[PDB]
Design a protein around this nucleic acid. Structure first.
Ligand SMILES: [Zn+2]
Lengths: 140, 63, 364
RNA sequence: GUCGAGGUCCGGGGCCCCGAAAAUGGACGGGGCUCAAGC
RNA sequence: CCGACACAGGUGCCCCUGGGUGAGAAGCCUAAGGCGUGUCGGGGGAAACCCGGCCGAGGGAACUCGGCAAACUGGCCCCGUAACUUCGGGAGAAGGGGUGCCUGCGGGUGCGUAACCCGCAGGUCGCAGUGACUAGGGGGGCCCGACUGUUUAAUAAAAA
RNA sequence: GCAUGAAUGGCGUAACGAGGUCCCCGCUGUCCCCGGCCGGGGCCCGGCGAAACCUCUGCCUGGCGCGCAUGCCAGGGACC
RNA sequence: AGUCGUCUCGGGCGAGAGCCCAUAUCGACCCCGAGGCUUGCUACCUCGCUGUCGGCUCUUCCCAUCCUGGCCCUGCAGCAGGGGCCAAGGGUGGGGGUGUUCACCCAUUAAAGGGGAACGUGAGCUGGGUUUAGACCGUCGUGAGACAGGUCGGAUGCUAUCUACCGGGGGUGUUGGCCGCCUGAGGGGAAGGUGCCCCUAGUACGAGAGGAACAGGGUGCCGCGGCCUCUGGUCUACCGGUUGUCCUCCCGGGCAUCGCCGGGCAGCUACGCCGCAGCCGAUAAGGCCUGAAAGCAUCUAAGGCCGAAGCGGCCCCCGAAAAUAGGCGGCCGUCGAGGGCUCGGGUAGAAGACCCGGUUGAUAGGGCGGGGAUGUAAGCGGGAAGGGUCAACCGACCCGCUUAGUCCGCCGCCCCUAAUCGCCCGAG
């Protein structure tokens, strides 16, 4: 088996609703330097005529930094969504919801560019990305 | 196969229904319906509603 | 081409007209070796949900998952006819058919209304509500002589197929009195064995437990819910016109080019929506109940009917099937099921799965 | 250098073949036709 | 009455208007007076679709020539208020806090415990107290014309 | 400065504007992606009851043709 | 419309460049062609009117193929590239400035192909540009004024006559009428298409760097057909709170968008949930066997075997008007089966049609019981910040009887009421 422990990606049994289209503003939950980002695209997604790309918990998006340190503003980066306001179903049939739309800035491979994550991290995102789960302090 | 207990009316609801709300500070609440969720978030007092389990505690509180 | 998008709607379900008959027809049958009737009929009861340990292949294997189920009540069918098919120039032709003579009805739920005794129903009295012209002075001797003639033709070898004619029994569940008549094919590779099976079951009652296997896949045939006339936006899912449009928004923009100088049949248009003949494939059979009860662990049995009864439906009283998912049709609709005609290579094991919870809470 | 009957080239004449891709479905007038019902 | 009409226009709204709320001849309710003749009726889950309204989860202009349409704000009291400037203004800039009902006091003019208005303390309910009705969205650059005003009655209101 | 310019005025300008234009906060069904509900039409039934328009007619594919034919040529379909 | 100078595309010779080697790749000079997708030329039809560019909506077609499927040569080690062939079933998206087509740019993507349909589509829409009438600037003109030079503003008419397509009905015919179940000529379909992940595997290959494939598992996205258990929206049924006013006050009500606000079952819905076979047959390019013409050789001349997301079948939908106008069991006729209207209701619905019930009865109503939505009614008793002669009485609000009261377009049991009387086709 390749990359037994160095793998940066995983799989999840739950698929959260894509409640965040292109143009949504996400709060940065880590200390990489950014504070607010805007979605300008969703990777690994094919749309259709006049359809905006949408992402949910555990999805990777391409975003432009709006607020943060001077060396981070106006920069195109990759982020992984860890919390969303739109409730989504889990295996037991129960719906889970969060308080805000929050994401963590990571490299395209999936290695976070920060060292601390604020607030809970969705179990789906933690399973999808091992590094995010490893660095997360609260997972629910 | 566990009956979650609503955080507003203090009653159990069947598996496959309801929802869980996660707060930023890390705590979790369970809501059996949109009615209970909306009342909790608006701030309606559950100790004054006879159909909630908190009313029994309030009755013991007063006497 | 500048911008490209897939066509709106499917042309493979045209014409989108009202179904020919409210009783669904089955055009094709599964090929099987086991000598059994290929399918069954029942009445839609409602929907609920269960929690079970998944067993089919996937990531969620061995884990507790949520699954919706449709409960359909299935009072036993009465096998009352046998039909034989020979080969014609262009296709199968009906060589002959024979039905049993009239017999007393021992499952009619008669109630002793004040005045007059119990009605004392008999067959050919519930059946005349559907056929309306039944044999007169029909006796067992002539019935047996007709059956013998049919067997003699089978021996001669001009009969290529045989089917069983059955009728529903709504009066048992007190849904209605008018029965519904259908014919079902039989599995196996010998017409003589199929005929012997049907002959043994002639005039008797047949239950789901004797034909269908728990945990196997099926195909469900029924007539969908009626929606009446609907516009193109809902019928074909076209795009709404721009909000500044002063000639409406829920209509197609252009219904064709200059040439050809005609409106093509492929342009979305308003018309009948719903009440269509449809077939859904690969619906798993979760469980078969008896007398409105489900046995879970051989120690606790629960009544499938939710508290307050099924909305728009009564109380389940007879055998019922729990199909995994949704089925076409309205409440009380007649729904037919056949063994899967097109199953996947990898399918769930043929057995009832492990059910951990059944929802019997009020659904209204 | 052993077989053992015509070989190896060149310029020409007739028919055919390749070179030969378009948009509503369809044009030898049509069916169709092969020692022709073609030349 | 005029417009071909028992015309949703114009002439004439030319003169006049109880009670409550309220700054108000505003909106809403109501007394007087008037009307059911802004004169074709009946049926219906009886559709599609069109005009006029009410709400819509998550995102918030990604739509479009262009935030077109809709939406936000909205009354009153208190604090607070920028660049610029012709010193007049900008200005209700911007922005922030309060608002219900009930029980008692203090104050102004007043002969008065008549009438109107202004504060204070306490108790209390709701998601919401200008609870309906009434009722501004705001800020920063550039071009043109100083401003109020006038214009193609019937496609141009503008820098003309 | 292809081809600005000082009374057919030059430059600037506070206040003003249903003038033209760019940006930001807030807002929102403009949009992702459309879904429900209400009143009036639409629909059916009983009455009063016109007008615009009208050579006669009125299915198609390839063609000939004043070069883009329901009506012609050869074919294909079509019960009212 | 004609033509193809021009435009797009293709071909012939092979100088020359490629370490040697014209043809892995490029192909000078010159010569022969296709298309009608750019522009031009002609003036053939239309000036008693065929309404412009762009955009939105929607349908369809061509291949000179951008991706997806299958292959050939290579200056093809692998991963990749360059060139060519078969193949049109499927896909070919989202944004910034600009009216823009186009071109440029951004982040994704398997790819983000070019074109025809009166430069498809205004009795479908929008009106940003073009192109009237108003006005400003530059230049030209003595002037009126002009500019394929800029700029602000500037109208989009319709009761469908025929045909066409979408659905819905009444008839005749099918060698007498009726009912019930079937067969399946013929038509339609994309009902499916396509990424990524684990393993094979740090393996084949390679000096290293780097780095595959067959097979086996999982899952996303787009498309299609269904359903309302769950979640969300709505829910002018319904319950509660409250503002102004009126019915004298209490209770209880009218109006003010449903007065406004919160919640809301049934129904309808999506943002929710479920379902969508990879196997046979023949083939295209291409890879081969046998084999002569041409004693050898040769995939082709005769003969044979494999071989594509393409073609046909399995699968789904319509289908006895399928003119060879079908089969079968039953019932009737030579009075009469079988129907229609009328009656009580929706598994249905614009009219028609369709389904269940009709005293062989639980179809609707009524009564009772179950399950629900709101959220504890009126009345009485007590407390209450206080005031009151600190007395009687007034008092927002609170507590108990009280999971109350109200209501139910959901279900079960009970014939208490209405499903009655009656009328008309109907083969011979
Ligand atoms: Zn609760």
């Amino acid at each position: 088996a390749k990359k037994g422990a160095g793998a940066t990606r995983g799989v999840s049994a739950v698929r959260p609703t894509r409640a965040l289209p292109v143009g949504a503003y996400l709060t940065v939950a880590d200390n990489s330097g950014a504070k607010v980002i805007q979605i300008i695209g969703v990777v690994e997604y094919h749309g259709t005529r006049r359809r905006l790309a949408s992402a949910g918990v555990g999805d990777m998006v391409v975003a432009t930094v709006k607020k943060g340190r001077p060396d981070m503003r106006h920069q195109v980066v990759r982020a992984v969504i860890i919390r969303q306001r739109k409730e989504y179903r889990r295996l037991d049939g129960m719906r889970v919801k969060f308080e805000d739309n929050a994401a963590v800035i990571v490299t395209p491979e999936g290695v976070p560019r920060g060292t601390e994550i604020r607030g809970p991290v969705a179990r789906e995102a933690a399973e999808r990305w091992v590094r995010i789960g490893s660095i997360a302090s609260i997972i629910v | 196969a566990r009956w979650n207990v609503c955080s507003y009316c203090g009653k159990p609801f069947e598996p496959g229904t309801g929802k869980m709300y996660v707060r930023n500070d890390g705590r979790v609440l369970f809501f059996c319906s949109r009615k209970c969720e909306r009342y909790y978030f608006m701030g309606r007092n559950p100790r004054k509603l006879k159909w909630t389990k908190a009313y029994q505690e309030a009755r013991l509180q007063r006497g | 081409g500048k911008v490209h998008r897939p066509r709106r709607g499917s042309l493979g379900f045209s014409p989108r007209k009202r179904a020919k008959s409210i009783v669904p027809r089955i055009r094709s049958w599964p090929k099987e070796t086991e000598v059994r009737m290929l399918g069954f009929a029942g009445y839609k009861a409602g929907m609920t949900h269960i929690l079970m340990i998944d067993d089919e292949p996937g990531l969620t294997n061995g884990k507790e998952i949520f699954m919706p189920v449709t409960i359909i009540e299935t009072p036993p069918l009465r096998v009352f006819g046998i039909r034989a098919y020979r080969m014609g120039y262009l296709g199968l032709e009906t060589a002959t058919e024979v039905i049993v003579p009239d017999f007393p009805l021992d499952n009619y739920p008669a109630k002793e209304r004040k005045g007059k005794p119990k009605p004392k129903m008999t067959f050919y009295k519930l059946l005349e509500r559907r056929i309306a012209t039944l044999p007169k002075n029909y006796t067992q001797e002539m019935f047996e002589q007709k059956l013998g003639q049919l067997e003699d033709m089978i021996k001669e070898g001009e009969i290529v197929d045989v089917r069983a004619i059955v009728a529903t029994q709504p009066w048992v569940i007190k849904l209605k009195k008018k029965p519904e008549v259908m014919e079902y094919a039989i599995g196996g590779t010998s017409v003589e064995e199929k005929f012997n099976y049907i002959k043994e079951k002639l005039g008797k009652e047949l239950r789901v437990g004797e034909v269908l296997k728990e945990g196997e896949l099926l195909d469900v045939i029924a007539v969908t819910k009626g929606k009446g006339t609907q516009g193109p936006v809902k019928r074909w899912g076209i795009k709404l016109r721009a909000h500044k449009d002063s000639k409406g928004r829920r209509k197609v923009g252009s219904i064709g080019p200059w040439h050809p100088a005609r409106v093509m049949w492929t342009v979305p248009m308003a018309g009948q929506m719903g009440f269509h003949h449809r077939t859904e494939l690969n619906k798993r059979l979760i469980a078969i109940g008896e007398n409105g009860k489900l046995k879970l662990d051989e120690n606790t049995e629960i009544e499938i009917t939710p508290k307050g009864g099924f909305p728009h439906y009564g109380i389940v009283r007879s055998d019922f099937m729990m199909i995994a998912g949704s089925v076409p049709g309205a409440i009380k609709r007649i729904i037919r099921v056949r063994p899967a005609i097109r199953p996947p290579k990898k399918k769930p094991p043929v057995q009832r799965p492990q059910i951990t919870y059944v929802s019997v809470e009020s659904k209204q």
